[PDB]
Design a binder for this molecule. Structure first.
Ligand SMILES: CC(C)(O)CC(=O)NCCn1ccc2ncnc(Nc3ccc(Oc4cccc(C(F)(F)F)c4)c(Cl)c3)c21
Length: 281
């Protein structure tokens, strides 16, 4: 068990991305000492017994990160906590699927759902519950390869039922979140239970009422969303299961997803004043 402290002198040319609820997110170049490398990084800077929680959390970030999980590099401590991670060139996935509504295909779409599921399968192994899984928290490394990030806390509409009412979070409750994430992607980035306000959700989730089958979706794919949305959380599928099935579908996707017959704003924005080799040193 150990931890890597970055001092600001290393962290160079630093510009803002966005002010999220958990805090602010910037970008910049990282020049570790002794190492001649320059590294494009993402820096998060957040905002009594919440702080002590901030240890055991990111200490779990030691170890062998999955190809599909965003891996922490280390921390800059100023008067605030800056978490530093390698920059994903294509920004966030939701934006990506939103911006790509027209061009996208089913080959791409299942390929991801496999990946996210495989990433979640890994965190499942390393005994850390995510709590906020949503399309908003999947980043795009390349048009074919994606990473899950964040895991560290008011989004009810991605939450499980027990998570709402009892405030208990297992890996099974992360599967619900996942289901909603898949729907998100099959809807080309739709907002779940739009117009239906947050108060009523638990109330009428009990009515067994759920998100409607996405247009481009087959029953074979839709069954799995509903599988995740079982109140009886034990009757939800294990992440390993999700990966296997999503692998089946990827070997004939037009049989499972029906579309017709690829750019990023964010990536385009990077092409100025500063993106290669992964750098897991
Ligand atoms: C527009 C907005 C409001 O800023 C939302 C927003 O986050 N937009 C996307 C920002 N973004 C774009 C490329 C990209 N590549 C990588 N990380 C990004 N963002 C990011 C998100 C969460 C972070 O914080 C955590 C917390 C917990 C765990 C980890 C870990 F390292 F394990 F993955 C990182 C950090 Cl450091 C960065 C990236």
């Amino acid at each position: 068990a150990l931890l890597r402290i970055l001092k600001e002198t290393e962290l160079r040319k630093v510009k803002v991305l966005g002010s999220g609820a958990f805090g602010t997110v910037y970008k910049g170049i990282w020049i570790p000492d002794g190492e001649n490398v320059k590294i494009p990084v993402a820096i998060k800077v957040l905002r009594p017994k919440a702080n002590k929680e901030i240890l055991d959390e990111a200490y779990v970030m030691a170890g062998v990160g999955s190809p599909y999980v965003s891996r922490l590099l280390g921390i800059c401590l100023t008067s605030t906590v800056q978490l530093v991670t390698q920059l994903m060139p294509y920004g966030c996935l939701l934006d990506h699927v939103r911006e790509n509504r027209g061009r996208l295909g089913s080959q791409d779409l299942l390929n991801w759902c496999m990946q996210i599921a495989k990433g979640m399968s890994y965190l499942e192994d390393v005994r850390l519950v995510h709590r906020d899984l949503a399309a908003r928290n999947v980043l795009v490394k390349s048009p074919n390869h994606v990473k899950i990030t964040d895991f560290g806390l008011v989004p009810i509409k991605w939450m499980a039922l027990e998570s709402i009412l009892r405030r208990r979070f297992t890996h099974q409750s992360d599967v619900w979140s996942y289901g909603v994430t898949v729907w998100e992607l099959m809807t080309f980035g739709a907002k779940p239970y739009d117009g239906i306000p947050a108060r009523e959700i638990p109330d009428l989730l009990e009515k067994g009422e759920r998100l409607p089958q996405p247009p481009i979706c087959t029953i074979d794919v839709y069954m799995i969303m509903v599988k995740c949305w079982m109140i009886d959380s034990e009757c939800r599928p294990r992440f390993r299961e999700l990966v296997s099935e999503f692998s089946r579908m990827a070997r004939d996707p037009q049989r499972f997803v029906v579309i017709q017959n690829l750019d990023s704003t964010f990536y385009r924005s990077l092409l100025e004043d500063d993106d290669l080799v992964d750098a897991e040193e």
